[PDB]
Short mmCIF file of C-alpha atoms and ligand atoms in Angstrom, two decimals:
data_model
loop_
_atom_site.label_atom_id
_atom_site.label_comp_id
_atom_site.label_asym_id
_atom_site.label_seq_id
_atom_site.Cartn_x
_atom_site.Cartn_y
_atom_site.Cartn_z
CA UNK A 265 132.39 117.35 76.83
CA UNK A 266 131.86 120.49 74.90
CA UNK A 267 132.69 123.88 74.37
CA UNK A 268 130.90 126.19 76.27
CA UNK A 269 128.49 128.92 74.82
CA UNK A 270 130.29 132.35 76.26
CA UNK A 271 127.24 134.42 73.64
CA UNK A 272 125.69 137.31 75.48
CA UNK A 273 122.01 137.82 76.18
CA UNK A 274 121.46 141.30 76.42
CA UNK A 275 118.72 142.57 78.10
CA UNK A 276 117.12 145.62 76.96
CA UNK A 277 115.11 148.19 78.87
CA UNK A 278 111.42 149.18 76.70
CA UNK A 279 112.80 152.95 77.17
CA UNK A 280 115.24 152.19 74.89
CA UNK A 281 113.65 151.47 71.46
CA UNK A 282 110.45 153.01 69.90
CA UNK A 283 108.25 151.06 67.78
CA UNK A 284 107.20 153.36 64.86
CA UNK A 285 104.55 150.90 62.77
CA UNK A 286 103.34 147.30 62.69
CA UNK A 287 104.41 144.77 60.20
CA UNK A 288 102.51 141.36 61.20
CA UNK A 289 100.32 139.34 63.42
CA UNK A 290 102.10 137.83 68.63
CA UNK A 291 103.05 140.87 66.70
CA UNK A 292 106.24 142.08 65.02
CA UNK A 293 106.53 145.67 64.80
CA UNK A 294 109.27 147.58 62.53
CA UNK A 295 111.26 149.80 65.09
CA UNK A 296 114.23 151.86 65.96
CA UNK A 297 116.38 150.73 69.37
CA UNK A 298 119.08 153.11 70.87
CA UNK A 299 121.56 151.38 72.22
CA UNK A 300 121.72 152.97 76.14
CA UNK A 301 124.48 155.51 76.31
CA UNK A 302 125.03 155.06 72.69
CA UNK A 303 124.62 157.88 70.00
CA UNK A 304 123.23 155.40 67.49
CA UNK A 305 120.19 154.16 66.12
CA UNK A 306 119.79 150.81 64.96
CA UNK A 307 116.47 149.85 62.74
CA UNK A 308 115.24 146.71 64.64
CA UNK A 309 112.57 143.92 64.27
CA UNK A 310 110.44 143.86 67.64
CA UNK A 311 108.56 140.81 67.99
CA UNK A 312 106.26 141.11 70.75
CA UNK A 313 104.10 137.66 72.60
CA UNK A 314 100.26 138.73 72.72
CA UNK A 315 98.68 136.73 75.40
CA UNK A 316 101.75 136.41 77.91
CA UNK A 317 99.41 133.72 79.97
CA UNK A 318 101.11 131.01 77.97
CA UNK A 319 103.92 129.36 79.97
CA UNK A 320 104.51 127.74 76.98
CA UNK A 321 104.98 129.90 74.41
CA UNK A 322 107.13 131.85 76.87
CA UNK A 323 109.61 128.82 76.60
CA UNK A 324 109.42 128.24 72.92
CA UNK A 325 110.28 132.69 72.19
CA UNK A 326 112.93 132.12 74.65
CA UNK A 327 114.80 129.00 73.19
CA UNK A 328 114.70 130.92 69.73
CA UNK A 329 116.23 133.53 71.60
CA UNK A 330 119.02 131.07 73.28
CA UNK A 331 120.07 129.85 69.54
CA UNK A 332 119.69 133.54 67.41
CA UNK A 333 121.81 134.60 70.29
CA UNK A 334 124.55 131.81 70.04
CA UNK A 335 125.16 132.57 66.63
CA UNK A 336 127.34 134.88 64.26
CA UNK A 337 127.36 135.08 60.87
CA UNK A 338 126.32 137.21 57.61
CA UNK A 339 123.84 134.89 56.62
CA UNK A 340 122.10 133.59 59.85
CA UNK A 341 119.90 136.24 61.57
CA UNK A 342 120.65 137.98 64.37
CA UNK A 343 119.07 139.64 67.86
CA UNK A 344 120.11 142.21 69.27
CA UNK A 345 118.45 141.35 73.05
CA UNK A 346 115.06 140.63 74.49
CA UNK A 347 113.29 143.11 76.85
CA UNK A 348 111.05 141.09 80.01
CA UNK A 349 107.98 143.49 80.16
CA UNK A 350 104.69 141.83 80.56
CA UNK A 351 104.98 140.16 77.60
CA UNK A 352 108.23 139.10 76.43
CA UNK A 353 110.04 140.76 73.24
CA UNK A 354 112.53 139.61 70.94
CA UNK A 355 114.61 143.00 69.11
CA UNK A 356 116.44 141.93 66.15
CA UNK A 357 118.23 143.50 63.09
CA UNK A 358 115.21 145.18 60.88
CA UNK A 359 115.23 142.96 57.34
CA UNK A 360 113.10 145.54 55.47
CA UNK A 361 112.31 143.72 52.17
CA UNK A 362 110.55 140.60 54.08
CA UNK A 363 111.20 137.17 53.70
CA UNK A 364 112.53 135.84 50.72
CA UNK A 365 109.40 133.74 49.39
CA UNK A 366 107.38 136.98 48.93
CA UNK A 367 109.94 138.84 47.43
CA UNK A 368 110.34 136.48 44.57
CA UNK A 369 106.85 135.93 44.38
CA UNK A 370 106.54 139.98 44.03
CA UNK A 371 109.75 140.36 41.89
CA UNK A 372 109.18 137.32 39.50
CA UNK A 373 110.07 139.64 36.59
CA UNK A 374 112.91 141.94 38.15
CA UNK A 375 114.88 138.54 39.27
CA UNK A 376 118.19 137.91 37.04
CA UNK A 377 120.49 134.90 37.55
CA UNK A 378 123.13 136.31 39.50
CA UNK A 379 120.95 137.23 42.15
CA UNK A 380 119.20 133.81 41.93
CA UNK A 381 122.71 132.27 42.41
CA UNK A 382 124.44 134.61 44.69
CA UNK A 383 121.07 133.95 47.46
CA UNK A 384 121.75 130.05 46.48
CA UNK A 385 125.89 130.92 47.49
CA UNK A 386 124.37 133.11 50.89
CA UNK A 387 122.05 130.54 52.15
CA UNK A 388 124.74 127.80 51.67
CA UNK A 389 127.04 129.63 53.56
CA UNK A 390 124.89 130.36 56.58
CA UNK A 391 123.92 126.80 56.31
CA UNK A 392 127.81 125.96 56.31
CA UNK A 393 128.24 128.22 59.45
CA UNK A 394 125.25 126.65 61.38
CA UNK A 395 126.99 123.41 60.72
CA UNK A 396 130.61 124.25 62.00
CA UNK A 397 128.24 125.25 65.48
CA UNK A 398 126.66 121.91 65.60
CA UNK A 399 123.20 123.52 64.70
CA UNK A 400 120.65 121.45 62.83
CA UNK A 401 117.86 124.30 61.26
CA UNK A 402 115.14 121.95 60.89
CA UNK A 403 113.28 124.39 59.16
CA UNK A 404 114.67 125.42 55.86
CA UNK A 405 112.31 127.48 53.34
CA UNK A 406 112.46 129.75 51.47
CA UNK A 407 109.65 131.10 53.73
CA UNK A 408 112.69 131.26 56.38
CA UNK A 409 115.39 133.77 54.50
CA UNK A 410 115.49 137.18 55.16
CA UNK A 411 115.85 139.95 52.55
CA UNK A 412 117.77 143.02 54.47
CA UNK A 413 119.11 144.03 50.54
CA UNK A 414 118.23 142.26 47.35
CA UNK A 415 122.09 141.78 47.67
CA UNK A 416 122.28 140.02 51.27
CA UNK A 417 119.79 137.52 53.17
CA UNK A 418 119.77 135.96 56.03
CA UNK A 419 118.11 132.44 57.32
CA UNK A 420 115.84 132.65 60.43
CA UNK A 421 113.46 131.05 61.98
CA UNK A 422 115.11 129.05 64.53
CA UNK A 423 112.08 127.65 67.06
CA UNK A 424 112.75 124.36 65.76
CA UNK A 425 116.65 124.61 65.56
CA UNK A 426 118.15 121.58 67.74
CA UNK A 427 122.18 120.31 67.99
CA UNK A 428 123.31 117.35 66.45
CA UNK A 429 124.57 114.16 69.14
CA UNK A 430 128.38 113.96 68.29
CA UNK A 431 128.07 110.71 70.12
CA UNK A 432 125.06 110.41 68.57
CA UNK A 433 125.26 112.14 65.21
CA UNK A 434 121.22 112.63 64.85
CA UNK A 435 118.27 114.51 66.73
CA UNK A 436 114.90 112.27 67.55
CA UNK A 437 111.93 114.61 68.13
CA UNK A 438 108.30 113.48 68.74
CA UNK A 439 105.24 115.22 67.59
CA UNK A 440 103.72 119.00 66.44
CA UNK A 441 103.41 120.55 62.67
CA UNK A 442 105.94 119.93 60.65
CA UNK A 443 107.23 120.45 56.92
CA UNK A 444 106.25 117.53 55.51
CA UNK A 445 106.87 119.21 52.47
CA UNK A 446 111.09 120.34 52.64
CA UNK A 447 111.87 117.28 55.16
CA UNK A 448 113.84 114.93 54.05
CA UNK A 449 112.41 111.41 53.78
CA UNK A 450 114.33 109.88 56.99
CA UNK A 451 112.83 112.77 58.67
CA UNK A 452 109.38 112.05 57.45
CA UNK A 453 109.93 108.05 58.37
CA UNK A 454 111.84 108.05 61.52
CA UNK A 455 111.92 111.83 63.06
CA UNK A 456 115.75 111.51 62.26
CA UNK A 457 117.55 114.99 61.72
CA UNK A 458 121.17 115.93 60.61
CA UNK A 459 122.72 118.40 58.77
CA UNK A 460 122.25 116.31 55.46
CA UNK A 461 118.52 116.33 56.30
CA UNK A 462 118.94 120.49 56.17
CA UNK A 463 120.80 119.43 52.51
CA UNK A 464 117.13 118.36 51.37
CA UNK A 465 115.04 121.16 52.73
CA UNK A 466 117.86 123.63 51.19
CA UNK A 467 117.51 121.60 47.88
CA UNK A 468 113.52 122.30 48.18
CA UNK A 469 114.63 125.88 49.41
CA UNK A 470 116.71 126.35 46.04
CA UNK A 471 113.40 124.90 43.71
CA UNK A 472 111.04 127.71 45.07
CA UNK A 473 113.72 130.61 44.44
CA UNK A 474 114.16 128.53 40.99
CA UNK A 475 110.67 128.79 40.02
CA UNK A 476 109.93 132.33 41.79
CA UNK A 477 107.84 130.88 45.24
CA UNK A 478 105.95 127.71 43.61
CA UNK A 479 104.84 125.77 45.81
CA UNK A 480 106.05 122.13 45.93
CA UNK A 481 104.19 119.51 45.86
CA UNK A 482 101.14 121.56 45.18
CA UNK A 483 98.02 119.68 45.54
CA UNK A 484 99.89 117.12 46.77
CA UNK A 485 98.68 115.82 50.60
CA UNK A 486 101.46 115.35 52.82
CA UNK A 487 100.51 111.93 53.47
CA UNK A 488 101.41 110.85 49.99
CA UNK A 489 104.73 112.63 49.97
CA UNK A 490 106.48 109.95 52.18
CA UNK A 491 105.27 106.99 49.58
CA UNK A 492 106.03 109.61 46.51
CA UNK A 493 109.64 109.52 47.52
CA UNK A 494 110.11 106.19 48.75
CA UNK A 495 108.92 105.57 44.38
CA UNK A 496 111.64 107.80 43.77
CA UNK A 497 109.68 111.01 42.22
CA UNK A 498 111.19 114.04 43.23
CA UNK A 499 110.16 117.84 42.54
CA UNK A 500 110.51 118.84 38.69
CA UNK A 501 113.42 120.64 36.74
CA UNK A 502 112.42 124.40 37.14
CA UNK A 503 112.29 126.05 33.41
CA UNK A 504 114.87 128.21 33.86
CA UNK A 505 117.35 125.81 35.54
CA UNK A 506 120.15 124.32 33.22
CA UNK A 507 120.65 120.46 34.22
CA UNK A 508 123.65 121.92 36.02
CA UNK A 509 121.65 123.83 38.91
CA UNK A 510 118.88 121.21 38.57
CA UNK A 511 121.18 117.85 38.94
CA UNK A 512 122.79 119.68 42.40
CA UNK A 513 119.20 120.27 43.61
CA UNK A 514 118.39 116.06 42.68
CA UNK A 515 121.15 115.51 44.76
CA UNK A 516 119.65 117.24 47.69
CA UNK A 517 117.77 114.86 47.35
CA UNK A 518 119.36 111.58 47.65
CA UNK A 519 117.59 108.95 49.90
CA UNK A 520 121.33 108.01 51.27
CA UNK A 521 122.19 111.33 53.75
CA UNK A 522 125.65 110.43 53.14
CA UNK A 523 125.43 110.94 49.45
CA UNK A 524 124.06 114.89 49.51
CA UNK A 525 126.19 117.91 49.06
CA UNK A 526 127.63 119.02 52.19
CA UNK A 527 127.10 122.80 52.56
CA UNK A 528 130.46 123.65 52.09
CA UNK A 529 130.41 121.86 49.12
CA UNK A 530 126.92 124.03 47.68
CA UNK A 531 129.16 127.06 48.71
CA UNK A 532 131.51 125.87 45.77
CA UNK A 533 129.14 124.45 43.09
CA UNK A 534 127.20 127.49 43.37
CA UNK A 535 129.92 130.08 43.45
CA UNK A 536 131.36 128.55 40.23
CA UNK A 537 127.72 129.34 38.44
CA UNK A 538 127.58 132.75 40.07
CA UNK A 539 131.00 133.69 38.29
CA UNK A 540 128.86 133.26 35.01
CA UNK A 541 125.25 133.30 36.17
CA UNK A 542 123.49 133.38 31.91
CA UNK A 543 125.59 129.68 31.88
CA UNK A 544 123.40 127.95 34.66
CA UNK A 545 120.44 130.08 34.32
CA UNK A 546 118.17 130.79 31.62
CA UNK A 547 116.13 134.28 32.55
CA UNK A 548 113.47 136.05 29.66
CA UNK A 549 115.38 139.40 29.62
CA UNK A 550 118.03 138.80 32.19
CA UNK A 551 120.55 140.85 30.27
CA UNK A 552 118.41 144.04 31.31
CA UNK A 553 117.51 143.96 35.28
CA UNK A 554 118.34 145.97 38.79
CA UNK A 555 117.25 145.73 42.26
CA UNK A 556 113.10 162.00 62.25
CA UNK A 557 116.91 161.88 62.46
CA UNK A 558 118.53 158.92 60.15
CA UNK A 559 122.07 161.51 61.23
CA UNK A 560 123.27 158.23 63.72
CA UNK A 561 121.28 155.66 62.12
CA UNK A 562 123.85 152.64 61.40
CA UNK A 563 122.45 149.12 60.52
CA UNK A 564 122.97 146.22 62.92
CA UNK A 565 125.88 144.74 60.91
CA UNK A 566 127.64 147.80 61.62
CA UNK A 567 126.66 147.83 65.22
CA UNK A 568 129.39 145.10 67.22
CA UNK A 569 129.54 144.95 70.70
CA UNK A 570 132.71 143.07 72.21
CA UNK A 571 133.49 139.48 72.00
C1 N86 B 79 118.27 138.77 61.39
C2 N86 B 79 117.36 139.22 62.57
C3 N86 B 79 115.90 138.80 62.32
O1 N86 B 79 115.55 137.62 62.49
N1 N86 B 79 115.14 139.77 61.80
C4 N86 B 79 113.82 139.76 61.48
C5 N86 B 79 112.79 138.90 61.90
C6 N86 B 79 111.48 139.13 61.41
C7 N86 B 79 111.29 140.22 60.52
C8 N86 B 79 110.04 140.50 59.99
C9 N86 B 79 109.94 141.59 59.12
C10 N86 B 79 111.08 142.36 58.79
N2 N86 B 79 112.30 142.11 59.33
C11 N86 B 79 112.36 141.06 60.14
C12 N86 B 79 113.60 140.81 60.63
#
């Protein structure tokens, strides 16, 4: 019916990883995990369940696990294993400069074009990948990229990530807190989900990047946004956006699926403005910006194990 999913689910013993300091609150701690019989070290994310008494949770950690697991790519996140102790942890790849909504918000003045546009490129392409496996994200946001460098991110968050029905070419969920904010409207109206409803939240993913973490909608309830769109109002043309960047964002947009980008598609329109970023972008001062033993440290994108 389909291919089968031959990813591995490594489990790791708590003997092999140290975490060194706390980075939020379960509770993700930044770490450092040595592979068993290894001579490496590998700078890991270890997020850790607090209460452990909740069946439920326990399901929800492990189904992110199932789908960070099943996938590969440069611009999709991914774990390293999970380690069964009393409460359940998740080790993934370390992405050291947080997610990408607070790093614009921090950086609003250090942020030139090309960076802008090459994140626009990164997060299109992961998107693209996630597509070509059948994955619907559900949850794009700027909230959910990664920053490992200020030149490579990564899209995670993938508790709410579902597959698409090939027979039938949409997901139908019911009930919990949602996005009302990046959903697309069909999503809003009828809990319908496909990879053109990830187009929208990546076009509302672009606008926050494109106005350095605004919020959208802001003061805005989300029960007004459905009627808001239905009357054809969409989120504003970011001041430094040419029309160029702005009208591909609008088209995100679209209240027909069908008539969205496809990601591959957002891979090409913004790869064209990345090969002249001062074009499609219009920066103040853009012209002038930059962004124990570490012996066997090696970063998880350097660390493969066999296929
Ligand atoms: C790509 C693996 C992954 O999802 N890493 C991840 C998750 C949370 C987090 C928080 C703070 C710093 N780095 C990470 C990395």
């Amino acid at each position: 019916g389909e291919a089968p999913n031959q990813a591995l689910l490594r489990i790791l013993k708590e003997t092999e990883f140290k975490k060194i300091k706390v980075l939020g609150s379960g509770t993700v701690y930044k770490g450092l995990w040595i592979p068993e019989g290894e001579k490496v070290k590998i700078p890991v994310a270890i997020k850790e369940l607090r209460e452990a008494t909740s069946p439920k949770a326990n399901k929800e950690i492990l189904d992110e696990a199932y789908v960070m697991a099943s996938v590969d790519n440069p611009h999709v996140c991914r774990l390293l294993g999970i380690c069964l102790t009393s409460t359940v942890q998740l080790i993934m790849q370390l992405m050291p400069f947080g997610s990408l909504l607070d790093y614009v918000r921090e950086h609003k003045d250090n942020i030139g074009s090309q960076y802008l546009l090459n994140w626009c490129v990164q997060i299109a392409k992961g998107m693209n990948y996630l597509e070509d496996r059948r994955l619907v994200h559900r949850d794009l946001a700027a909230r959910n990229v990664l920053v490992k460098t200020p030149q490579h991110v990564k899209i995670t968050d993938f508790g709410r990530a579902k597959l698409l029905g090939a027979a039938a070419a949409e997901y139908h969920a019911e009930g919990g807190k949602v996005p009302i904010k990046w959903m697309a409207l069909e999503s809003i109206l009828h809990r319908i989900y496909t990879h053109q409803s990830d187009v929208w939240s990546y076009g509302v993913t672009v606008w926050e990047l494109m106005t350095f973490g605004s919020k959208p909608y802001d003061g805005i309830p989300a029960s007004e946004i459905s009627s808001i769109l239905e009357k054809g109002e969409r989120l504003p043309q970011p001041p430094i956006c040419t029309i160029d960047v702005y009208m591909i964002m609008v088209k995100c947009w679209m209240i027909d699926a069908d008539s969205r980008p496809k990601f591959r598609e957002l891979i090409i329109e913004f790869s064209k403005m990345a090969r002249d970023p001062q074009r499609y972008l219009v920066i103040q001062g853009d012209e002038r910006m930059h962004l124990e033993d570490m012996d066997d440290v090696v970063d998880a994108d350097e660390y493969l194990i066999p296929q």
